[PDB]
Design an enzyme around this catalytic site. Sequence first.
Site, PDB file in Angstrom:
ATOM      1  N   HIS A   1       0.827  -1.209   0.000  1.00 21.89           N
ATOM      2  CA  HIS A   1       0.000   0.000   0.000  1.00 21.89           C
ATOM      3  C   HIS A   1       0.867   1.266   0.000  1.00 21.89           C
ATOM      4  O   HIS A   1       0.512   2.281  -0.600  1.00 21.89           O
ATOM      5  CB  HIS A   1      -0.888  -0.002   1.255  1.00 21.89           C
ATOM      6  CG  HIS A   1      -1.869   1.130   1.323  1.00 21.89           C
ATOM      7  ND1 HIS A   1      -2.550   1.447   2.478  1.00 21.89           N
ATOM      8  CD2 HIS A   1      -2.312   1.994   0.375  1.00 21.89           C
ATOM      9  CE1 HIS A   1      -3.372   2.454   2.241  1.00 21.89           C
ATOM     10  NE2 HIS A   1      -3.247   2.805   0.973  1.00 21.89           N
TER      11      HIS A   1
ATOM     12  N   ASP B   1      -1.340  -7.157   1.318  1.00 24.66           N
ATOM     13  CA  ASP B   1      -0.648  -5.912   1.626  1.00 24.66           C
ATOM     14  C   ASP B   1       0.687  -6.238   2.278  1.00 24.66           C
ATOM     15  O   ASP B   1       0.834  -6.197   3.499  1.00 24.66           O
ATOM     16  CB  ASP B   1      -1.515  -5.057   2.552  1.00 24.66           C
ATOM     17  CG  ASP B   1      -1.086  -3.606   2.576  1.00 24.66           C
ATOM     18  OD1 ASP B   1      -0.149  -3.230   1.834  1.00 24.66           O
ATOM     19  OD2 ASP B   1      -1.709  -2.836   3.330  1.00 24.66           O
TER      20      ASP B   1
ATOM     21  N   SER C   1       1.092   2.216   8.635  1.00 29.45           N
ATOM     22  CA  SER C   1       1.142   1.126   7.663  1.00 29.45           C
ATOM     23  C   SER C   1       2.570   0.613   7.460  1.00 29.45           C
ATOM     24  O   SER C   1       3.539   1.384   7.518  1.00 29.45           O
ATOM     25  CB  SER C   1       0.555   1.576   6.317  1.00 29.45           C
ATOM     26  OG  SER C   1       0.641   0.529   5.358  1.00 29.45           O
TER      27      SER C   1
ATOM     28  N   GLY D   1      -0.250   6.421   8.724  1.00 34.08           N
ATOM     29  CA  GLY D   1       1.165   6.647   8.923  1.00 34.08           C
ATOM     30  C   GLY D   1       1.835   5.457   9.590  1.00 34.08           C
ATOM     31  O   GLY D   1       3.062   5.403   9.659  1.00 34.08           O
TER      32      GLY D   1
END
Length: 247
Positions: free
Chosen positions: A46, A97, A198, A196
């Site tokens: 992502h 992801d 991730s 922020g």
Amino acid sequence: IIGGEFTTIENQPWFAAIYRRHRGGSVTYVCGGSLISPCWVISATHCFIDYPKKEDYIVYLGRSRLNSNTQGEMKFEVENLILHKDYSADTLAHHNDIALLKIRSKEGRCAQPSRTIQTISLPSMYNDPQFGTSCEITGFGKENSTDYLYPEQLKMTVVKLISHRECQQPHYYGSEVTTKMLCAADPQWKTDSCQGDSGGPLVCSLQGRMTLTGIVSWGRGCALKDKPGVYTRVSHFLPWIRSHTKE
Ligand SMILES: N=C(N)Nc1ccc(CNC(=O)N[C@]23C[C@H]4C[C@H](C[C@H](C4)C2)C3)cc1
């Protein structure tokens, strides 16, 4: 990270801070990551899907602060950016992801272990902690949903692993959460990951050993009731990890 406490990399030695170089000279924070081997950092796709240029990224290890230096820190270039081919984003859910970043310093070397730079162990095939187990997340993400800036100091918090049955309930996420994902939340819904965070790690003590159990991925809002943070289940991507890290 909503709530939790401020910390330092000595407490989270495997944490990697990923920044992106911009046209001019401004370097902005992108996502978190984890050092799984001297040459490899694992993060989330992502974070790089919209800007797949490996040359535009900088990886910092042994870094406790966002815009300031930390002694012992090491700066790395990205030799190879491996994004998962089956990555996709739905209404809320982000599938597959996960991403791998092969790093190297300007001298062509990988990370050198120290008190501030350490690797984290990967889980065993399908071996995850029992639901209800306490785990920790770390990141430079938002402290409140209404913030537009990230905190200057690294943060961490402890959340509890929630079963798939519970996370699949109607008022939670329903059929949006899959077996390739893990849900975790504060029983009081006071602490959680946020924008922020991730790519950062969800670390769990499994059989007396710190293990990279998940990767911060998605969730409805931040620290909202019945809306747990959802993480990429690392144990289900071991074949993928091993097949891309060999060479
Ligand atoms: N309830 C949660 N725990 N909600 C949750 C869980 C994970 C995330 C993490 N998601 C992000 O960091 N988004 C991005 C979205 C884009 C701009 C920045 C950098 C990356 C691309 C990743 C922030 C957010 C919210």
